Design a protein around this motif. Structure first.
Motif, mmCIF file in Angstrom:
data_model
loop_
_atom_site.group_PDB
_atom_site.id
_atom_site.type_symbol
_atom_site.label_atom_id
_atom_site.label_comp_id
_atom_site.label_asym_id
_atom_site.label_seq_id
_atom_site.Cartn_x
_atom_site.Cartn_y
_atom_site.Cartn_z
ATOM 1 N N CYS A 1 6.431 3.827 41.846
ATOM 2 C CA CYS A 1 6.835 3.954 40.454
ATOM 3 C C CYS A 1 7.020 5.425 40.115
ATOM 4 O O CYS A 1 6.165 6.252 40.436
ATOM 5 C CB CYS A 1 5.786 3.318 39.545
ATOM 6 S SG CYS A 1 6.010 3.608 37.782
ATOM 7 N N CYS B 1 4.121 6.559 37.179
ATOM 8 C CA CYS B 1 2.682 6.578 37.396
ATOM 9 C C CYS B 1 2.292 6.595 38.866
ATOM 10 O O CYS B 1 1.113 6.390 39.174
ATOM 11 C CB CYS B 1 2.023 5.381 36.702
ATOM 12 S SG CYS B 1 2.317 3.795 37.489
ATOM 13 N N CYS C 1 6.983 -2.015 37.536
ATOM 14 C CA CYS C 1 5.648 -1.627 37.951
ATOM 15 C C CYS C 1 4.620 -2.586 37.368
ATOM 16 O O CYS C 1 4.770 -3.077 36.249
ATOM 17 C CB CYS C 1 5.348 -0.197 37.517
ATOM 18 S SG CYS C 1 3.769 0.426 38.107
ATOM 19 N N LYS D 1 1.599 -1.813 36.585
ATOM 20 C CA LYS D 1 0.596 -1.082 35.832
ATOM 21 C C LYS D 1 0.930 -1.084 34.348
ATOM 22 O O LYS D 1 2.095 -1.049 33.950
ATOM 23 C CB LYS D 1 0.487 0.355 36.337
ATOM 24 C CG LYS D 1 -0.702 0.629 37.237
ATOM 25 C CD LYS D 1 -0.729 -0.260 38.462
ATOM 26 C CE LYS D 1 -1.927 0.060 39.326
ATOM 27 N NZ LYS D 1 -2.185 -0.954 40.371
ATOM 28 N N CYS E 1 2.174 2.819 32.504
ATOM 29 C CA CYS E 1 3.574 3.205 32.443
ATOM 30 C C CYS E 1 4.405 2.232 31.628
ATOM 31 O O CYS E 1 5.599 2.473 31.436
ATOM 32 C CB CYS E 1 4.161 3.324 33.849
ATOM 33 S SG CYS E 1 4.143 1.804 34.787
ATOM 34 N N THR F 1 7.437 -0.226 33.697
ATOM 35 C CA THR F 1 8.769 0.354 33.737
ATOM 36 C C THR F 1 9.520 -0.073 34.991
ATOM 37 O O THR F 1 8.927 -0.491 35.985
ATOM 38 C CB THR F 1 8.695 1.875 33.674
ATOM 39 O OG1 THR F 1 10.012 2.414 33.798
ATOM 40 C CG2 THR F 1 7.841 2.412 34.796
HETATM 41 ZN ZN LIG Z 1 4.139 2.443 37.023
#
Ligand SMILES: [Zn+2]
Lengths: 52, 148, 191, 171, 121, 67
Positions: free
Chosen positions: A20, A23, A34, A36, A39, A42
């Motif tokens: 990514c 992040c 991503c 996570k 972020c 994204t």
């Molecule tokens: Zn990310």
RNA sequence: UCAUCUAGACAGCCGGACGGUGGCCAUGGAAGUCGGAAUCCGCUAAGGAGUGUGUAACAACUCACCGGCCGAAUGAACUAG
């Protein structure tokens, strides 16, 4: 030298991933977003930089 | 025993192919020139058949080459390397003759179709005094018998 | 959008028997038995004809009908794990230092110990979850086989053995050393 | 509020140069006659060059539902103003009458797009006379053969503040 | 558009069934387009080869079921990859040509329908 | 042995299901569900008990075991 | 808003993915794939004068297209709670 098939098997887990851009998370190679939260899931992803 | 096919502008790499067959490059070129003596001005497919001693050169029929030859062309040195755009008359008989010359080689679908394909091959040639090549082929049934 | 009825099916083979009270599933087969608590997922089960069981959710959202196919896959994995079993083959990968893997016993608990991974003096011990059998396979160099009924237990033990051999402070694209799972399948594959 | 449908017919005031104007008619969903006539003049000021001072209303009549106990599917075409622009939407509602259908439409737009009564324009509402012209899945779901479903998790509200047994949610 | 192309297929098939009494059902596996093209050329004079989506074909036969009722027997055989050969020649001569041509490391005739009669052959 | 599930059936809503009106102007009579509007409301009719044919929210009725 | 759809759609497997033709210029070469223009027929169920990998140029592999299994909705772009 390891072996060609064994280098392929180890690189399946170590090198054939995506990163990514926001992040730096190590992601599945066919991923679109991503996983996570920080972020914001994204879609700015890049391939993990190989050698050679 | 071995057949090698090359597209060669006439009147003339060849050596690399020749070395495998152990044939002199000059000898091959001379033989090809004689064969293309008929198709020299422009590129034509040449078939070389090797008897393990010498190679025999023949010019295989190609639609583009036959069409280009049919369009009357002033001989071009090619030193200029000009665009040399090809402009041609309708030459309906010549195309039909070309279709017949193909003789449905490589299984053209129909005698009329072989002509239609021959017309398409004239992407390069104008192929008509006043029309797009093969534009009227669908429209006119004339010459279907001639191709056969 | 509140799908008012969505429904999946699971096929029950001839050898197994499935017992479902409230949301506790017990599957009994030739290789043994397995159980599963599913009181967190809120579905309903229905036996049709003793070889088919439908699972359904009524008036469910998108996440809820996702969980329906998830729980169908879990109970079907349990059924195929008690019929055919589960076998994970992992391979040893090294450049210079050979990885030396044995089985030891601190207080009778069947530990897998890993020695000389990249030449260190540290000994990595991973415990073995119950129901998982480990065989160091012959006739293929440097290969370990973990077999069992529960895909969760077998794959988690294989994953713990993979994660215990991670390389620190080095470029891991060059230092590819480790123990990696190469094959996942059944004990009686192509039955 | 609880909506009613009215026809409102009006015209321009007659002049000597032109007596008998053309008597325009519109169908309004509104709470009462005053709001119905206000919305009538609002849409005629959007359409033609007329206003309330220059025109008059010749008739207002309540149109109640012809079959209030038939279950219909209605397709509704709507304009609404969002915070950035104006959009057209088509929503379809399975319900028993036109006024109740537009009441659930107003609730649906206020719930899902935060659109208010001042922002929603009702272009048209029409009964879909044939099935398989239904295009939304949330209403096509209820048109299947032998539709039946259970109601899990019954909650019974109590009158006492204390209950003397653990309640059951069987239905 | 899609429907129009489809409609033409239905019509041609009906005409072909009427035109030729002899029908050969041929199964093609791993047969190249070039391999197919050569077979077509060899049999252009005496045979017609038709390839189509099975779902499309079954509906057509059911649609044309009232006429030519015996063709209904062909429907069980239609399952799987199939091709239709319509030929004036009665049987063996066509069959011999199809199997022999273009065998490489393979056309096979799964079933033969002639005059309302089905032959495993 | 044989596979055993707990069936856990309850009181489906469909046409012909007899319901008891819990609150409202009827408030204690029986009706029959004629059709289903959506997930939350149905068209019922109670013609022997004097319940008029109407659409009603499912929270105002109780479903009975009678069909 | 465009498209596809029980005359079989989108994912997943499996098979074909062809001739005229190495289409015309241009290059030491470039044959679908360094570029410039055109971009048409045949056989078709279907296949671009080519989507990429790809070689000095080939060869080779894969595509977007059509087919067997699946049997029912799905793809792209955009808007706003
Ligand atoms: Zn990310």
């Amino acid at each position: 030298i390891i072996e060609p098939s064994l280098k392929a098997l180890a690189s399946k887990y170590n090198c054939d991933k995506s990163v990514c851009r926001k992040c730096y998370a190590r992601l599945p190679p066919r991923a679109t977003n991503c996983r996570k939260r920080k972020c914001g899931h994204t879609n700015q992803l890049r391939p993990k930089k190989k050698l050679k | 025993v071995k057949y090698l096919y090359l597209r060669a502008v006439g009147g003339e790499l060849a050596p690399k192919i020749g070395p495998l067959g152990l044939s002199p490059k000059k000898v091959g070129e001379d033989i090809a020139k004689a064969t293309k003596e008929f198709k020299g001005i422009k590129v034509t497919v040449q078939l070389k058949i090797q008897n393990r001693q010498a190679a025999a050169s023949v010019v295989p029929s190609a639609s583009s080459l036959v069409i280009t030859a049919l369009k009357e062309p002033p001989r071009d040195r090619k030193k200029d390397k000009n665009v040399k755009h090809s402009g041609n008359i309708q030459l309906d008989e010549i195309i039909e003759i070309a279709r017949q010359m193909r003789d449905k080689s490589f299984g053209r679908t129909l005698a009329s179709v072989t002509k239609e394909i021959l017309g398409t091959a004239q992407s390069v040639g104008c192929r008509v005094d006043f029309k797009n090549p093969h534009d009227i082929i669908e429209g006119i049934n004339a010459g279907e018998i001639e191709i056969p | 959008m509140k799908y008012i009825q969505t429904e999946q099916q699971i096929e029950v083979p001839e050898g197994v028997t499935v017992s479902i009270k409230s949301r506790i599933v017990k599957v009994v087969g030739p290789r043994g038995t397995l159980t599963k608590n599913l009181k967190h997922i809120d579905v309903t089960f229905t036996k049709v004809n003793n070889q088919l069981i439908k699972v359904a959710v009524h008036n469910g959202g998108r996440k809820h009908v996702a969980a329906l196919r998830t729980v169908k896959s879990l109970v079907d994995n349990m059924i195929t794990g008690v019929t055919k079993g589960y076998k994970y083959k992992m391979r040893y990968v090294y450049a210079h230092f050979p990885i030396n893997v044995n089985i030891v016993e601190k207080d009778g608990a069947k530990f897998i110990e890993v020695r000389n991974f990249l030449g260190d003096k540290k000994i990595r011990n991973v415990p073995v979850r119950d129901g998982v059998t480990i065989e160091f396979s012959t006739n293929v160099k440097d290969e370990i086989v973990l077999s069992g009924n529960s895909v969760e237990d077998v794959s988690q033990n294989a994953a713990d053995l993979q994660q215990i051999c991670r390389v620190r402070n080095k470029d891991i694209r060059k230092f590819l050393d480790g123990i990696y799972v190469s094959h996942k399948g059944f004990i009686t594959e192509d039955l | 509020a609880h909506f009613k449908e009215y026809q409102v017919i009006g015209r321009r005031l007659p002049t000597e140069s032109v007596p008998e104007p053309k008597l325009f008619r519109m169908r309004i969903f509104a709470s009462n006659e005053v709001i119905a006539k206000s919305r009538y003049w609002y849409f005629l000021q959007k359409l033609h060059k007329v206003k309330k001072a220059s025109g008059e209303i010749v008739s207002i009549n309540q149109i109640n539902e012809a079959h209030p106990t038939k279950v219909k599917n209605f397709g509704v075409w709507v304009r609404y103003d969002s915070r950035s622009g104006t959009h057209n939407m088509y929503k379809e509602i399975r319900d028993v009458s036109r006024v109740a259908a537009v009441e659930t439409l107003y609730q649906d737009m206020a719930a899902r797009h935060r659109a208010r009564f001042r922002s929603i324009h009702i272009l048209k509402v029409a009964e879909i006379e044939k099935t398989a012209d239904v295009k939304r899945q949330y209403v096509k779901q209820f048109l299947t053969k032998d539709l039946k479903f259970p109601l899990p998790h019954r909650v019974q509200k109590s009158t006492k503040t204390f209950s003397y047994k653990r309640p059951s949610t069987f239905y | 558009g899609i429907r129009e192309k489809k409609a033409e297929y239905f019509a041609k098939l009906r005409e072909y069934l009427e035109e030729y009494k002899s029908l050969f059902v041929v199964g093609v596996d791993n047969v190249s387009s070039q391999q197919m093209h050569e077979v077509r050329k060899e049999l252009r004079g005496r045979a017609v080869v038709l390839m189509g989506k099975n779902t499309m074909v079954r509906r057509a036969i059911r649609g044309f079921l009232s006429d030519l009722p015996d063709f209904e027997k062909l429907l069980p055989f239609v399952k799987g990859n199939v091709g239709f050969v319509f030929t004036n020649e009665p049987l063996t001569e066509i069959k011999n040509v199809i199997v022999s041509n273009r065998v490489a490391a393979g056309l096979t005739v799964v079933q033969v329908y002639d005059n309302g009669q089905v032959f495993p052959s | 042995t044989d596979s055993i599930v707990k069936a856990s059936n309850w009181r489906l809503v469909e046409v012909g299901r007899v319901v008891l009106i819990k609150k409202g102007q009827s408030a204690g009579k029986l009706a029959a569900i004629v059709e289903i509007i959506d997930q939350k409301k149905v068209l019922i009719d109670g013609p022997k008990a004097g319940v008029p044919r109407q659409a009603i929210n499912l929270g105002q009725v109780v479903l009975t075991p009678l069909t």
